[PDB]
Write a protein that binds this DNA or RNA. Structure first.
Length: 69
RNA sequence: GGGUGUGUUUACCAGGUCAGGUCCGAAAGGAAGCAGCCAAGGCACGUCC
């Protein structure tokens, strides 16, 4: 379960714009998304890292449930 | 090394465009700009000087 899927599924159109600023590699291996990328992704989707760093948290809570059942 | 062809590769660090999103503006409208793509470069191979 990568970001690509997590995308399928107001505050929504912004949680998407934040993914639309990533690269295919990222949308697959979110881990590699450390500091510098996090940055690029914020400013690209017009956000604050807190936003990007936020979504990643969501993909995680989400990843977990998924990689559980 | 140069021209050119092909395959492969390349998050951002003043190339072009820029979905999406952001910015400024009461508005009309401006502004920067990620991903993509194009371009460019890297690695090879073919070919020409």
């Amino acid at each position: 379960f990568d970001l690509n899927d997590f995308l399928e599924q107001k505050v929504l159109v912004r949680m998407e714009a934040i993914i639309n600023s990533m690269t295919m590699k990222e949308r697959a291996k979110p881990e590699i998304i450390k500091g510098s990328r996090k940055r690029r992704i914020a400013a690209g989707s017009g956000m604050q890292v807190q936003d990007v760093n936020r979504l990643l948290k969501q993909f995680d809570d989400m990843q977990r449930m998924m990689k559980k059942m």
